Design a protein around this ligand. Structure first.
Ligand SMILES: *[C@H](C)[C@H]1/C(=C/c2[nH]c(/C=C3N=C(/C=C4\NC(=O)C(CC)=C4C)C(C)=C\3CCC(=O)O)c(CCC(=O)O)c2C)NC(=O)[C@@H]1C
Ligand SMILES: *[C@H](C)[C@H]1/C(=C/c2[nH]c(/C=C3N=C(/C=C4\NC(=O)C(CC)=C4C)C(C)=C\3CCC(=O)O)c(CCC(=O)O)c2C)NC(=O)[C@@H]1C
Ligand SMILES: CCC1=C(C)/C(=C/C2=NC(=C\c3[nH]c(/C=C4\NC(=O)[C@H](C)[C@H]4CC)c(C)c3CCC(=O)O)/C(CCC(=O)O)=C2C)NC1=O
Ligand SMILES: CCC1=C(C)/C(=C/C2=NC(=C\c3[nH]c(/C=C4\NC(=O)[C@H](C)[C@H]4CC)c(C)c3CCC(=O)O)/C(CCC(=O)O)=C2C)NC1=O
Ligand SMILES: CCC1=C(C)/C(=C/C2=NC(=C\c3[nH]c(/C=C4\NC(=O)[C@H](C)[C@H]4CC)c(C)c3CCC(=O)O)/C(CCC(=O)O)=C2C)NC1=O
Ligand SMILES: CCC1=C(C)/C(=C/C2=NC(=C\c3[nH]c(/C=C4\NC(=O)[C@H](C)[C@H]4CC)c(C)c3CCC(=O)O)/C(CCC(=O)O)=C2C)NC1=O
Ligand SMILES: CCC1=C(C)/C(=C/C2=NC(=C\c3[nH]c(/C=C4\NC(=O)[C@H](C)[C@H]4CC)c(C)c3CCC(=O)O)/C(CCC(=O)O)=C2C)NC1=O
Ligand SMILES: CCC1=C(C)/C(=C/C2=NC(=C\c3[nH]c(/C=C4\NC(=O)[C@H](C)[C@H]4CC)c(C)c3CCC(=O)O)/C(CCC(=O)O)=C2C)NC1=O
Ligand SMILES: CCC1=C(C)/C(=C/C2=NC(=C\c3[nH]c(/C=C4\NC(=O)[C@H](C)[C@H]4CC)c(C)c3CCC(=O)O)/C(CCC(=O)O)=C2C)NC1=O
Ligand SMILES: CCC1=C(C)/C(=C/C2=NC(=C\c3[nH]c(/C=C4\NC(=O)[C@H](C)[C@H]4CC)c(C)c3CCC(=O)O)/C(CCC(=O)O)=C2C)NC1=O
Lengths: 65, 160, 96, 161, 160, 161, 161, 160, 160, 161, 160
């Protein structure tokens, strides 16, 4: 049950002399049971959630996760 | 199911499923023509199991029938049989599945939340479920209730 | 390796790779099963966060979490804290 | 993450000038209505579980999604939903003291719009629930603070729809 | 007290106490005689409160006393009055301390793990506090009922 | 951990020999009462939240530890004591199916003495509670498995002492 | 990840009907041929590092694709595509026991199309490798279960091309 | 602001606002009419504060107004005041918010990279913003020179 | 053993044991008589197994007898037949323990680095177990060869 | 952690009784001296970068310790020595605001033999720095506030040696 | 290349390149022609360095030629020449770059999981390439066989 986020987050307080292109464009896959503790982490950072996608199976299926 | 729990465990070890567990699926499929009698007997007594286990519960906890509990009135004792029937509509989904993977995702995973959110104490809910799975063990055979009664009594410790 | 090639593909980040690393059975056998519980709270807190435990109320918040949810949410709750994410980042290997 | 004092600062900074007389007329307007916003913050956070256990009772408890075929029979899905409607009560009361709808934007509204489409749940049942949450919360805190909490409920409601 | 949570919120930011919070401490110490007059009138009528709020709890929920539920005789109903005596005692401690941290560390951490083991309803404890709120705020003054009742709602946010 | 088979196996592995007939005799006795324990483990996990309530009211409630001064007076410290007894009911039922107190040794009783002495937790009330709990589980499982369940409870009270 | 047993469970609770008569012969069809699958899935694990002996040696070993210039010429690109064939066998055998290809499109087919068009992997070489490994399993499980394994092998090749 | 700090601290523990913290906001809102007239004490006299600290900066450091220095000429000097005109605007934002949070996000988090790139000395700015402090508190009252001056002294130590 | 997978995979979620996993316990203690007869017969002809499956292994892979290989001379082939007797003993532990885990811990998790540090080929011993299972399933019964031959099949399938 | 308020209502909680007139008199003894501390805690907070500046020049500077061969020679060690002094002013104002040295037993006297011994910090220079810091603090804060602050400086260096 | 190793050594710490490191590049340019003279001596004398040193490997290890092993006389010993010819090609890729990584990314990164699936002894490749570079150092000089000697020994320590 994995999602597929794509997240644009800026650097809040620090001016990072290394590149950190990947630290502004997490387009990772997060599973369902730990997305919502993870979604608030981007949300408290001031990031922007662009899209979320169901990379796994069908919604509404109440068994088999 | 027991097929489903074995293959997700073998994915975690990143190997094929073990010959210890391959006995169990082989034991599940020779008992696949053993599990189906438990499923059909609960069809023939689902109007008999629930209508007796309510009064078994209401003689154990008559705080519910008193005015002020969460099932008081004829419109309110409808759900205190309907939520019990819904749990009888969960075991037969997992008798033939063998284990608790349809028991969890329909019944268990947030059941501390919504009965608190509806105001019903789950200790009364688990009591009638325990009152249910004394009558269903007496209805089934001594060999049927030896394993399904162990499977019956998961839900009482899972709820409360 | 099926945790690993998701990182080599770029389908997960490193912070998701650490969580899918320390939920495996080889980590669970080595540092959870064969230890005392509050030792095993402290050692996974030693490896992943790179520091010891801070005191008592920072550890009592972890001991009830593995009493109810299990080990799989103990290793979750170290990682999605603010002190993991804002002191290491989402693309660094942790260090002591 | 901002509030109504710093949003007036930010609307004056990005325009350029100092604290002009239009902003002080806006800022003194916040300090008058800020007294009632605290006295309606406590009586929501007293009855936070009592609101959401009644707001589900107006719209959701006997409908399509209790007879089999919808969102909530699966016990995790109903318990997420009471927990989702709990967090609307927290963030609107975070929006009530802060005096702006922009705290709801960087905490609720940006992510939640595309998940609910993707997870197949109805937004139309959610906006029916928050409007049912609006008609009980005005009865608890009084009507005059209900016009305050009717603003940020509608910003969730117009934002999700 | 109000000294403690002006320190542990200033130790997480790791700097000194700014004068934005030192004036509230400076207004707290000069207002010391007001809170003792709240507390002594609160504890001076401790039999007027619980004997009235015990009746108003049982009119809001008559199912604790009816045969089947939790509290019976003059023993188990009496320890229900003991817990309301505790929470009346525990709410005058935060009034003198001027903060909700002494009611926090004694009774706003973990009872949702606790009361389900005891079998009492959690929400029926919370209806006892609202009857305790309406008794004490009717007894106290018109201005301090917005202050003493500003702790009474915090117990409602604990359970409910 | 270690299991009663994997202690009989590991006794004959460090000697390097094959399976001795005394060890084969030591495995038939585990298999003769293995059908009893597998029914015993379900009947405790059914009443696992129930037993602790029937144990703490047998010897701890209405006494001088849940009264002002004791370690269960603070009611959000008494909540530790309930889940402290949830561990000793869970891990003893693990050790009943294991046939071996080695679950309790390096997982529970390794640093249990040092935790309790570094807090002022009464040892003599814990052994007063666990030996009271042993009577309750023997009432619920019957006197056959109550001898078996009484061993691993007594292993908990011995190493804690 | 869900099998055919959970799928008929999934399609029975959601409409409000009980475990009816028509669901039983879907399960009895599983329980009839499920004995065949445990005879099948053990023997694949006997040759799980031996099918991949034959996987290169039939269609990939002494070819021009391995000759310097082709795609399968590096040691970092060789060993990455034996594990990428070994995973396609192991997840097939999960579906051989599932009675369902619904372990494939969660863990195998989720990002597998776009990762081959981007990494320069030829699609036609894989379906000439996977469909070549259908018939060597036909000599190892017998005639009928290889035709059952040919369903999920074609479900790979329907979901790869 | 104190409203912003009390939400974000209380959001991370997933809790509502404490009654100790709600009375912090309640005194902060009602004293907001005090702080806005400290802000208009400076913006009513902003063109004098720039000009006096303009004369006071180039007296104590004349190399920046000298030829070769980075503010030399009638347009190149015009800018350094206009940069000081920004810091009247920033500190007036700080007195209104009651915190250095608009000083952070607007004014001070990148100055160690900017003026090193722009060639102007940071310590040349750090005395010009300190000569701003001496001309401001002579125009303010007695008690608020500690209140407004804390936002001044924050801009000294974060500069140098 | 059977418990050692189940007592760990349910401890990690900190729950009690699910009754699908109690089938796995029940599932065998009924097979423990059948699991004990086969390892008594395997130990009872453990000299005939190693002297036969060691013999025609060298008719299949004659390289390790040949000079330049490792087991040149009788002083190393008898050292080589220690690992045949060790792995025969580790089969008989795993049949009695019931599943995959005791042969995995004692003789598997270092063999890609033990045998590389010894310089011996890791594939050739994997040929020998397939002949060790050839002579063993040739001498036992037919019904246990689907059980006892599969415990051979694990230590093949994780060797090569 | 506790203060003069939360030692009284801790010690009067644990006897079970309410707040009585013997303990309210202990609160009024703290409330009579509370106005003295808030004036004392304000002036140290405006001079925290300057009490440290003078006290290092009182006893530490131009010594063996400043010179090479001493400990605070390297710039890296030197700043730290201001920082490992600056906790001793901030935590001493917290205990002065508390009226109880219970913070000082808890945050700033744990490793204070074992950190300083395992880092080459001399103990005897830190105690000489602190009464060099107490003399300039009691000169800055007054005679009456200097002895109340003087308890919590001499509580630290007595526990540190 | 040694240019390519230098940038990522500086880009990891986000730095412009050190002038001591450009001395290594400036020495690499003026000694760039010398390494091309090293590489043509290998490619010119390829047919005497492969058939000889492979025969040294077959004289040191006569396990390889014998049946039952990895190779056999008609083409399997011939294709173990071309699997040995690839590494000499990779050394000549490595010495003209002045870097290890043309040996790395083509022929190191997955050789253990390759040759276990191919069934050859990886250590015999390492003893074969040790026999390859023993005669390669005696080919060209004694001066140029030292800094090209530093790229010979790495592939020995990569297989084991
Ligand atoms: C009464 C209105 C409600 C109620 C009360 C009730 N409680 C118990 C038992 C206990 N209650 C506590 C609670 C506390 N103890 C404390 O020291 C504090 C803080 C100062 C609190 C909140 C505890 C520890 C117990 C157990 C032992 C004890 O009594 O101290 C009972 C008895 C239950 C039983 O089974 O014996 C009752 C009846 N229950 C209700 O139904 C009312 C809603
Ligand atoms: C309850 C009947 C008894 C009791 C319990 C009690 N325990 C604590 C605190 C802790 N208990 C533990 C327990 C364990 N740690 C382990 O690793 C294992 C093995 C699985 C067990 C069982 C721990 C770690 C703590 C302390 C950490 C923390 O800060 O919570 C308390 C709290 C004491 C306090 O003052 O905070 C209590 C009350 N005490 C009794 O009186 C009963 C006999
Ligand atoms: C190595 C390849 C690479 C680069 C270059 C890169 C840049 C980059 N530029 C950024 C921001 C920024 N970039 C600029 C850019 C400019 N200002 C202007 O007015 C001009 C138009 C322009 C420069 C001449 C500004 C203003 C920001 C801050 C706004 C933001 O947060 O995005 C950020 C956001 C994080 C932050 O710096 O706070 C990144 C990651 N990322 C990469 O991976
Ligand atoms: C199959 C999975 C499933 C679960 C877990 C479930 C729980 C569930 N129980 C409900 C109500 C209820 N459940 C009960 C049942 C009880 N309360 C009592 O007091 C009795 C003692 C007790 C039974 C033991 C009652 C009375 C209501 C309605 C509550 C109300 O109207 O206030 C509701 C809201 C109404 C609805 O749409 O059904 C849900 C979602 N429903 C499901 O479909
Ligand atoms: C604080 C900002 C924020 C919001 C608002 C939020 C929503 C959110 N709602 C979710 C699920 C859910 N929410 C519902 C909601 C409902 N069911 C109904 O019938 C109604 C229409 C509605 C509520 C009464 C359902 C059915 C699911 C489960 C669907 C799924 O599994 O994806 C989930 C996935 C798991 C979780 O609960 O954490 C998130 C993340 N997340 C956030 O971070
Ligand atoms: C569990 C389900 C699953 C599958 C099936 C899978 C495949 C997979 N194959 C990959 C690469 C690869 N796949 C191949 C494939 C082949 N080479 C050939 O000669 C043939 C055309 C084909 C034979 C199978 C090659 C060469 C690469 C590496 C690309 C490179 O060399 O850079 C990668 C990129 C990461 C890497 O290995 O470097 C993934 C993720 N991943 C998964 O998670
Ligand atoms: C509100 C936050 C903020 C800051 C801090 C800021 C600084 C700032 N100062 C600038 C230039 C400058 N700033 C100065 C100011 C100074 N140089 C001196 O010699 C004096 C000592 C000193 C003033 C104390 C001058 C002279 C220039 C122009 C330099 C040049 O063009 O080379 C510039 C480039 C041109 C411009 O003003 O647009 C910026 C962006 N801008 C901002 O928006
Ligand atoms: C408990 C798990 C375990 C096993 C099974 C094991 C075997 C083992 N094999 C050894 C040596 C060896 N074992 C072999 C065996 C073989 N090489 C081959 O070519 C064949 C594939 C195979 C036998 C047919 C050889 C050749 C040596 C000697 C290695 C040498 O002389 O360099 C030794 C050291 C010699 C001794 O102590 O007598 C041990 C301990 N050790 C363990 O710890
Ligand atoms: C309050 C909780 C707390 C404690 C106990 C604390 C102690 C403390 N003192 C330290 C260092 C040090 N401290 C000094 C000490 C001094 N300078 C002098 O000249 C005097 C002799 C002396 C003190 C007046 C030196 C000389 C070092 C070592 C810094 C290093 O080598 O990294 C360090 C190592 C610096 C680091 O963190 O890497 C710690 C942790 N820090 C804390 O946050
Ligand atoms: C440059 C990076 C790179 C390497 C290293 C590489 C190796 C490589 N070695 C191979 C085969 C082989 N390699 C050997 C080698 C040996 N057997 C022995 O007895 C000796 C111990 C040993 C070498 C001295 C043999 C016998 C085969 C054929 C295996 C077979 O056909 O089954 C093959 C398969 C056939 C071929 O295409 O040549 C490849 C692809 N390919 C690459 O792209």
């Amino acid at each position: 049950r994995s999602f597929k986020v794509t997240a644009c987050v800026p650097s809040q307080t620090r001016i990072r002399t290394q590149r950190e292109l990947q630290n502004t464009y997490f387009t990772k896959l997060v599973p369902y049971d730990n997305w919502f503790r993870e979604q608030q982490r981007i949300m408290k950072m001031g990031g922007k959630i662009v899209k979320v996608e169901l990379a796994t199976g069908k919604p509404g299926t109440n068994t088999g996760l | 199911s027991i097929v489903t729990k074995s293959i997700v465990n073998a994915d975690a070890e990143a190997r094929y499923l073990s010959p210890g567990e391959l006995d169990r699926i082989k034991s599940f499929v020779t008992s696949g023509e053993r599990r189906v009698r438990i499923a059909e007997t609960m069809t023939g007594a689902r109007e008999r199991i629930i209508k007796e286990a309510g009064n078994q519960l209401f003689q154990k906890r008559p705080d519910v029938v008193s005015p002020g509990g969460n099932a008081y009135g004829e419109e309110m004792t409808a759900t205190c049989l309907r939520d019990l029937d819904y749990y009888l509509r969960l075991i037969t989904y997992g008798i033939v599945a063998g284990d608790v993977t349809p028991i969890e995702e329909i019944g268990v995973v947030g059941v501390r939340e919504m009965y608190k959110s509806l105001g019903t104490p789950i200790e009364a809910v688990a009591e009638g479920v325990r009152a249910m799975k004394s009558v269903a063990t007496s209805l089934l055979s001594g060999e049927d209730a030896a394993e399904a009664g162990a499977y019956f009594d998961y839900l009482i410790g899972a709820m409360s | 390796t099926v945790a690993e090639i998701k990182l080599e593909n770029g389908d997960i980040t490193v912070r998701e790779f650490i969580r899918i690393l320390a939920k495996s059975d080889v980590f669970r056998n080595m540092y959870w099963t064969s230890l005392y519980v509050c030792k095993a709270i402290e050692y996974i807190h030693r490896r992943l966060l790179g520091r010891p435990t801070y005191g008592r109320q920072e550890m009592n918040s972890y001991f009830d979490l593995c009493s109810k949810k299990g080990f799989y949410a103990l290793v979750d709750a170290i990682i999605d804290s603010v002190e993991y994410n804002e002191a290491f980042g989402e693309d660094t290997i942790p260090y002591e | 993450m901002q509030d109504a004092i710093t949003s007036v600062i930010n609307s004056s900074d990005v325009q350029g000038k100092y604290l002009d007389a239009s902003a002080i007329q806006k800022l003194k307007a916040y300090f008058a209505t800020g007294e009632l916003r605290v006295r309606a913050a406590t009586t929501i956070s007293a009855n936070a579980a009592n609101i959401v256990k009644e707001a589900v009772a107006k719209s959701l408890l006997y409908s399509d999604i209790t007879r089999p075929g919808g969102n909530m029979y699966t016990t995790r899905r109903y318990a997420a939903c009471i927990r989702d409607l709990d967090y609307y009560l927290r963030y609107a009361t975070y929006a009530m003291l802060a005096g702006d709808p922009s705290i709801l934007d960087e905490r609720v509204l940006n992510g939640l719009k595309e998940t609910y489409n993707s997870l197949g749940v109805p937004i139309g049942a959610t906006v029916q629930a928050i409007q049912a949450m609006k008609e009980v919360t005005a009865g608890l805190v009084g009507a005059d603070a209900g016009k305050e909490m009717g603003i940020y409920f509608d910003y969730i409601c117009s934002g999700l729809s």
